[PDB]
Paper text:
Aconitase superfamily members catalyze the homologous isomerization of specific substrates by sequential dehydration and hydration and contain a [4Fe-4S] cluster. However, monomeric and heterodimeric types of function unknown aconitase X (AcnX) have recently been characterized as a [name] (AcnXType-I) and mevalonate 5-phosphate dehydratase (AcnXType-II), respectively. We herein elucidated the crystal structures of AcnXType-I from [name] (AtAcnX) and AcnXType-II from Thermococcus kodakarensis (TkAcnX) without a ligand and in complex with substrates. AtAcnX and TkAcnX contained the [2Fe-2S] and [3Fe-4S] clusters, respectively, conforming to UV and EPR spectroscopy analyses.
The crystal structure was elucidated by the single-wavelength anomalous dispersion (SAD) method using the selenomethionine (SeMet)-substituted crystal, and subsequently refined to a resolution of 1.6 Å against the data set from the native crystal. Alternatively, we attempted to separately superimpose each domain of mAcn onto the crystal structure of AtAcnX, and found that domains 1–4 of AtAcnX each consisted of 157–336, 337–435, 436–569, and 1–149 residues in the order of 4-1-2-3, respectively, from the N to C terminus. AtAcnX crystals were brown in color, similar to the purified protein, strongly indicating the maintenance of cofactors. The electron density map suggested that this enzyme had a planar [2Fe-2S] cluster (gray mesh in Fig. 4a) located within a solvent-filled cleft in the protein structure. The water molecule further formed hydrogen bonds with the side chains of Glu292 and Lys530. The superpositions of the overall crystal structures showed that the [2Fe-2S] cluster in AtAcnX was roughly located at a similar position to the [4Fe-4S] cluster in mAcn. Among the [Fe-S] cluster-binding sites, only two adjacent Cys508 (green) and Cys510 (blue) in AtAcnX were located at equivalent (or close) positions to Cys421 and Cys424 in mAcn; the characteristic motifs of Cys-X-Cys and Cys-X-X-Cys were often detected in other [Fe-S] cluster-containing proteins.
Numbering used by the authors: 11 to 569
The structure:
């Protein structure tokens, strides 16, 4: 039995335990502390005050900001107990201790002690021990940093570059220490994700660092934000929400981040190349960068993305190291006849459920020749159910020939798994009032494909059709006529916002049920919006847009 202090602190409370990872953004409501992931075993449970046992986290990089907000409002669990490596929630609690004078203890157990303690009714944590129903286990103190540092690293840490840079380096070194890294690594560019207005604390952190003098040292793009930056006032977004959401975006721009406002930064001209070491947040962008581009970045939590951008340095750990990019589990995926575009997000979603805490190699799919957009949708869905920052697809992705670990296990995704996942993501009626496309932000080709399915037909008056995309794609779609073709059918194309960040009234208030082709939004949509969510192919979406009805049925390749 082994217990390891990750972040110090004292806590006591009832045990809240699960064997399935949870994403605090999208899966936990900062207003209540309740689990809102409708597909998680803990759905509906309030986490406030509990000692939360889960193997690790999954999903969104924004969990750090949601946990920070919960800590600040007193709605957070009293402690976190994992049994695997974890970064997102650990970083949120680390920022709480470093910058907000609040300690949330985080402990990692061995898997067997984890399972035993998860049966307990009550757990007490202090600096030296964890006790489950009185049964006490000694807790090893936080790991001591054994990092190789450059002279400029030490200069930043000593404060010779100011207090903001020192604070960033302090956080980077503490994260490297808990990961057991022995060095840092240069990054050529950053991508900031905490600009989504997921909680008041997201704004508080950004303005705190900006007022501290923080500024990025490497070129750094920005993920989606929670306002249509140029239009939210005219759209009728309430001032109480739009003003802090806009100020959150403004704070990162003031700190030198480029206002790309997109969750598909790999589509920008600034996209990194194969082998390039970058420092990115946003789970789908991280996974796409490693998986499809062959670039290298850990799945950095929100807030850590800014520290890495401020210093140009990240912990040399995880998939920055070649050994850690080798496939850790093999997945044979059934390839039925007659697949369409919906196959790829479904497979990514199921691949994450099958392999939630290590890097999988997906076999059996190379002959199907997935598009860049197919890989994009797959990676985004994989992020929702997994913690890993990358995956491999035999015959499709550039590093898929890396030798798997000699002890890799092999699992399957069967047709039966696919039918079950399809029905899980389709718990809603047939009548829909909204079609939601573009999580992550739509490519230009995805917009062209959508116009091709529409074939000049016009949406039903009672069905809104909304595509979220980055500004540069919308500009390009305006040039080549795709934007007008979509407008001709009644489709709205929105910049900056994504389905992760959209809000009423831009999200139409009349909506009761929506259909999406995003595996990611199919998962998060129910809890985020309170609406019933349907999941289908691009053409399933267009058919619903023209008729107002999404037929409830398994796809052709599953019947
Ligand atoms: S911001 Fe979440 S995928 Fe777009
Ligand atoms: Mg996710």
């Amino acid at each position: 039995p082994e217990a390891r202090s990750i972040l110090a602190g004292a806590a006591e409370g009832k045990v809240i335990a699960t064997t399935e990872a949870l994403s605090f953004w999208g899966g936990v409501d900062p207003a209540t502390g309740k689990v809102i992931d409708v597909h998680h075993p803990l759905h509906g449970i309030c986490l406030t005050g509990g000692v939360l046992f889960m193997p690790t986290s999954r999903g969104s990089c924004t969990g750090s900001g949601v946990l920070l907000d919960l800590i600040l409002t007193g709605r957070a669990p009293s402690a976190l107990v994992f049994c695997e490596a974890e970064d997102v929630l650990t970083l949120g609690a680390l920022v709480a201790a470093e910058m907000f004078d609040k300690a949330l203890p985080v402990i990692r157990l061995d898997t067997e002690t984890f399972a035993r303690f998860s049966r307990a009714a009550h757990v007490r944590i202090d600096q030296n021990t964890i006790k489950a129903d009185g049964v006490s286990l000694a807790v090893a103190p936080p790991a001591t940093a054994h990092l190789d540092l450059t002279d400029d690293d030490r200069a930043m840490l000593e404060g010779r570059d100011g207090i903001a840079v020192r604070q960033a380096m302090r956080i980077i070194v503490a994260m490297a220490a808990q990961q057991g890294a022995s060095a840092l690594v240069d990054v050529t560019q950053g991508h900031i994700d905490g600009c989504i207005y997921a909680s008041p604390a997201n704004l508080t952190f950004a303005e705190k660092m900006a007022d501290m003098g923080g500024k990025v040292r490497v070129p750094s793009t920005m993920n989606a934000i929670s306002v249509d930056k140029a239009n939210w006032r005219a759209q009728g977004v309430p001032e109480d929400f739009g003003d802090p959401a806009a100020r959150l975006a403004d704070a990162y721009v003031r700190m030198g981040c480029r206002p790309t406002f997109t969750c598909s930064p790999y589509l920008l001209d600034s996209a990194p190349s194969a082998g390039e070491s970058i420092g990115w947040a946003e789970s789908n962008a991280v996974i796409f960068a490693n998986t499809v581009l062959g670039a290298r970045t850990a799945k950095h939590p929100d807030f850590l993305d800014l520290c890495i951008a401020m210093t140009g340095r990240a912990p040399l750990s995880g998939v920055y190291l070649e050994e850690n990019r080798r496939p850790q589990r093999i997945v044979d995926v059934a390839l039925p006849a007659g697949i369409d575009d919906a196959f790829w997000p479904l497979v990514g979603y199921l691949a994450g459920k099958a392999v939630p805490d290590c890097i999988p190699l997906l076999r059996g799919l190379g002959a199907a020749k997935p598009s860049r957009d197919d890989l994009k949708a797959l990676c985004a869905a994989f992020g929702t159910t997994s913690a890993s920052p990358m995956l491999h697809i035999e015959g499709a992705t550039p590093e898929a020939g890396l030798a798997p670990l000699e002890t890799a296990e092999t699992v399957t995704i069967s047709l039966e798994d696919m039918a079950a996942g399809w029905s899980l993501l389709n718990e809603g009626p047939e009548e829909v009032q909204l079609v939601a496309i573009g999580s992550p932000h739509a490519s230009l080709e995805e917009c062209r494909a959508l116009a091709a399915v529409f074939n000049g037909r016009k949406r039903h008056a009672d069905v809104a059709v909304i595509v979220t995309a980055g500004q540069q794609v919308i500009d390009a779609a305006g040039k080549d006529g795709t934007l007008q073709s979509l407008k001709d059918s009644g489709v709205q194309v929105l910049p900056d916002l994504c389905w992760c960040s959209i809000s009423e009234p831009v999200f139409p208030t009349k909506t009761r049920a929506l259909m999406t082709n995003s595996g990611k939004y199919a998962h998060y949509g129910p809890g985020l919006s309170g609406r019933a969510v349907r999941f289908g192919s691009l053409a399933d979406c267009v058919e619903s847009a023209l008729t107002g009805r999404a037929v409830s049925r398994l796809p052709v390749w599953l019947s």
